[PDB]
Structure 1
């Protein structure tokens, strides 16, 4: 069988792969999207399904007010002593001389279970990872941040013993490794294999310069020798490769005695007839997860097929297990549980923000704050996972002020989004309008040419057609006949590469929202949500 990369499409960065007997799991980072930490499962490493988000209660994860691309950075998922261990990081400051954050540990018998109250770790840097050694000792490793303005911020990798008995870090923390001249040394994981401790790190930063390198030591404290052939993984030198930004990896040893390496990538939109070294590309699907096969040479791991990483990869010798889709293309909102592929921003949804119970067969969003708010938005959304797809919904809404709007939205962060809305105007009553924000530049391109909605229309149908480099919205008053709204958007503008600011770590979403600035919590009822990839 063949692995066809990427294995986890759309926004799914920083893969932490972990084996539990013959089950395989990957944890990916979720940043401001709630509930936190995606966990996907596989039997064969080829086919994956989404199965859990452990961080689903305020006591585990409180991101109210968190900056864009703050919150959950690279997660670390392990399996030891018969249970799963999750190290996660809440990032509070995403730019400037500091990166204030807090690391925590939680555990659970199963990935989809009720995770334990969190244990407080440290905050010396992000990318915390829990290593379970073969002598029963446990160690936390993370990057150590140097805020000093005349120094590179990535001071190296710190190691400190973790005591499960005391439920805290113990002993002295030590810097064990400083990285290579590529720098941005982060993503540490340790593996004790045969004669060595192997320290895997990401380097170069999570852009086109991304890489993974491996160092080794006979003792856990180092010093570590660097692979003479470093990096292990990178496509920096090959701008034509389908998989770019190859780094932030983690290693798995299969029950079939084979070796695979999960890592993030970006897949740029077509760059066209433009300088291939200069214009490396825009990635609206964010950072995704791929897996490479590893072979060993002179006691160093090496990527089969070359450092750049390959698209089609020989799968492990395991019977094929494909999964049915975890969502319906047309979700009629007939269940009381919101589909696992939907997230909301920063905080748990409550019945005062969203309800599937108020009116059977509908999702009712009670209007809250605007698309620019980092507090409470009545907004659920799912990832773009293809460059070509249709998404649609229909909504009943009776706004009586321009302070009320409900609609379909393509969204990256609070200053990068577009939306088609049902809202209201003094002279025309209920109308369809377009609103967008392009790195904090706001526009309403239709101006007075909004589209009036007849009083007798109950559900207004709204659709977006995403077609690689561009996308466009349409509406329908009968669910059959659609009309195009003349605002065409560039997909590249909902990409990690385009958005401004220190945090550019998520990806494009498509979703539905209800805004009510007045405080009246006006309800909008959505009859369905469609997502269909082409």
Structure 2
């Protein structure tokens, strides 16, 4: 019935929410704007994007945010007639500190205009809101320990949230320290039968990842741990195509069934490599998957052992499928950018990105370079398949090497490749390749660049991704294409390749314009094509 992952490409930190017979997953968006994606389903198999809640600077201001900063795992719940969304803005992602803030916004409907944030606390990420039977509300999050002699993951902190006062009240208490896996995060609370169940993520979001669960009769513990913990992990299953299984959330359907959504990474093919030495590279980042649960002696169990199954049986409901929500060839005739497109850190106004200046075109006025955490004229969508083609057609007339426009495959400010139009003193208007690998830049077509003929209005730019490797090609007519003589490697656009380990996103493909002279020179993109192959 259901083949995993249900949300492919960059979809980490899934939070699942039942409202009667409708089902929602919110996922993390990190430095990508707007913040948070929410998908809806009737059958837990087919999913459509229904909301992008954090779209006002008053809710989310990420200017200058570090790569993999911003919106970490969000938490979606529904109570007292409305949806409650908890989210982070993480400012510091390397070193002894992890400075970041937790906020609450609400809405009566999933896709309405959500409130402005209520500040909660800053003590650690992965905040979650629990709505207890007695009407009381409680916030759980991880508690961060910066000290040199200590492990940073101090445990799970709980504090009561007063709806009326719009603040946490009483005193914060640590209710759980974790198991020896440590790196205890992603807390979620569930009242099931006579117990409070505390779900956590442990072992860290790489290959040691796990979901741990514990129970207590008191909300403040002590929590006894599942006798066969972890509840879920891929660590002991180095051949399982789904790796890094953890950061889960429990759903109890109206049909009286139990399911567990979680993140996972799907490494590239590794045949010929030591099984255990390095466990793989995931260009699609961390994706969302689902597992069935069954109950024994008051403990849930992942059906089919504690590793993730590639295929599961969905709940006992009618299949409800959805119509495709993007054009394979986006001609840019719409009056609002398709909802699979996102921007870096900030909203781009009409002065930077516009469908109005030239109907049928996305116009990007040139801003800062691909290494800037501030203002980039860059519109991009997720790699969502191992095998795909992406294509654009652009008119751009640069007058200086400081200006560029092109097709970009992008992980972060220091890790990307592009096929771009720029200008050269002797050759004039040119096509080139450019890579950035940990801030180190290469120009592979150095002194060998494609001269673009004066009479050519539109350059056609394409990338063809074939799992491990990909290639850029170009055309001056849309019919006759020419390969550029460089093979690129997808593993360099993956979480696992990044040396900082603040690497929580996934690969994007998009359209970029830079004008480092500040002459407000723009590029006109006639269309954007993305097609699974």
Does the alignment reach a TM-score above 0.5? yes
Structure 1 distance, partners of 2:76, 2:19, is: 11
Distance 1:473 1:355 in 2: 26
How far apart are the structure 1 equivalents of 2:107 and 2:191? 24
Q: What is the count of residue pairs matched by the alignment?
A: 533
Distance 1:20 1:402 in 2: 54
Output the CA distance in 2 between the equivalents of 1:383 and 1:421. Answer: 19
- Structure 2 counterpart of 1:102: 101
- In structure 2, the partner of 1:284 is 283
- Give the equivalent residue in structure 1 for 2:33: 34
Q: What is aligned with 1:231? A: 230
Q: Deviations over 1:285-334 (max 9, x none)?
A: 00000000001111001100111110110100010011111111000000
Distance apart, 1:369 and its partner CA: 0.3
Q: Match for residue 418 of structure 2?
A: 419
Counterpart for residue 324 of structure 1:
323
Q: What are the residue-to-residue correspondences of 1:371-382 with 2, within 5 Å?
A: 371-382=370-381
Structure 2: how far apart are the matches of 1:380 and 1:499? 22
Q: Secondary structure at the match of 1:497?
A: helix
**Cα distance between partner residues in 1 of 2:226 and 2:42:** 31
Q: With structure 1 as the length reference, what TM-score do the two structures score? A: 0.99
Whole-Å separation in 1 of the counterparts to 2:520 and 2:434: 21
Superimposed CA distance per residue, residues 237-269 of structure 1 (whole angstroms, 9 cap, x where no aligned partner)? 110001110000000110111100000000000
Counterpart position of 1:299: 298
Q: Which residue of 1 aligns with 2:137?
A: 138
CA shift, 1:109, in A, is: 1.2
Q: Is the 8 A contact 1:80 1:132 kept in 2?
A: yes
Offset at residue 277 of structure 1 (A): 1.0
CA distance in 2, matches of 1:502, 1:58: 28
> Superposition pairs for residues 459-470 of structure 1, below 5 Å?
459-470=458-469
Once the two structures are superposed, the pairs formed by residues 149-160 of structure 1 within 5 Å of their partners are 149-160=148-159
Contact 1:370 / 1:377 at 8 angstroms: preserved in 2?
yes
Whole-angstrom CA distance in 2 between matches of 1:207 and 1:259: 26
* Counterparts of residues 420-459 of structure 1 (less than 5 Å): 420-459=419-458
Deviations 1:351-406 (A, max 9, x none): 01100011100000000000000000000100000010000001000101000100
Matches within 5 A, 1:23-62: 23-62=22-61
In the TM superposition, residue 411 of structure 1 has moved relative to its aligned partner by 0.2
The CA distance in 1 between the partners of 2:204 and 2:312, in whole Å, is 25
Q: Using the TM superposition, give the Cα deviation of residue 3 of structure 1 relative to its aligned residue in structure 2, in angstroms.
A: 1.1
Contact 1:271 1:279 in 2 (8 A): no
User: Does 1:81 find its partner at 2:84?
Assistant: no
The 2-side partners of 1:492 and 1:426 are apart by 35
For the 8 Å contact 1:234–1:245, the answer to whether it is kept is yes
Corresponding residue number in structure 1 for 2:64: 65
Cross-structure match for 1:309: 308
1:335-354 deviation line (CA, Å, top 9, x unaligned): 01000000000001100110
Contact 1:408 1:421 in 2 (8 A): yes
1:357-372 aligned at under 5 Å gives the runs 357-372=356-371
Q: Matches of 1:345 and 1:113 in 2, distance apart?
A: 23
> Counterpart of 1:191?
190
Moved more, 436-445 or 26-35: 436-445
* Counterpart residue number, 2:472: 473
Q: Is the 8 A contact 1:94 1:502 kept in 2?
A: no
For residues 157-168 of structure 1, what are the structure 2 equivalents within 5 Å? 157-168=156-167
The alpha carbon displacement at 1:279 in A equals: 2.2
- Secondary structure of the 2:486 match is strand
Q: Which residue number corresponds to residue 530 of structure 2? A: 531
CA distance in 2: counterparts of 1:469 and 1:71, whole angstroms: 29
The answer to whether the 8 Å contact 1:159/1:173 transfers is yes
The aligned counterpart of 1:209 is: 208
- 2:273 corresponds to: 274
**Whole-angstrom CA distance in 2 between matches of 1:197 and 1:324:** 39
Partner of 1:112: 111
**Structure 2 CA distance, aligned partners of 1:524 and 1:440?**
25
Q: Is the 8 A contact 1:76 1:88 kept in 2?
A: yes
Aligned residue for 2:179, secondary structure, equals coil
Displacement of 1:180? 0.2
Taking the aligned partners of 1:487 and 1:409, their CA distance within structure 2 comes to 15
Task: Name the CA distance, whole Å, in 2 between partners of 1:311 and 1:27.
Answer: 21
More moved, 322-331 vs 65-74: 322-331
Q: Which runs of 5+ in 1 are unaligned?
A: none
Deviations 1:402-437 (A, max 9, x none): 001000000000010000001110001111011111
Q: What CA distance in whole angstroms lies between the structure 1 residues aligned with 2:81 and 2:485?
A: 57
Structure 2 length-normalised TM: 0.99
Q: CA deviation at 1:440?
A: 1.8
Aligned match of 1:256:
255
Q: Does 1:265 align with 2:264?
A: yes
Matches of 1:304 and 1:467 in 2, distance apart? 33
1:487 counterpart SS class:
coil
How much has 1:513 moved relative to structure 2? 0.5
CA distance in 2, matches of 1:298, 1:177: 22
Cα RMSD, aligned residues only: 0.6
**1: distance between equivalents of 2:244 and 2:467?**
20
**Distance in 2, Cα, partners of 1:224 & 1:80:** 25
Shift of 1:104: 0.1
Residues 46-75 of structure 1 deviation map (CA, whole Å, 9 limit, x = unaligned): 111112110011100000000000000010
Structure 1 runs of 4+ with >3 Å offset: none
Name the SS for the 1:44 alignment partner.
coil
- Conservation of the 8 A alpha-carbon contact between 1:72 and 1:89: yes
Post-superposition shift, 1:502?
3.6
Q: Tell whether the 8 Å contact from 1:367 to 1:404 is kept in structure 2 after alignment.
A: yes
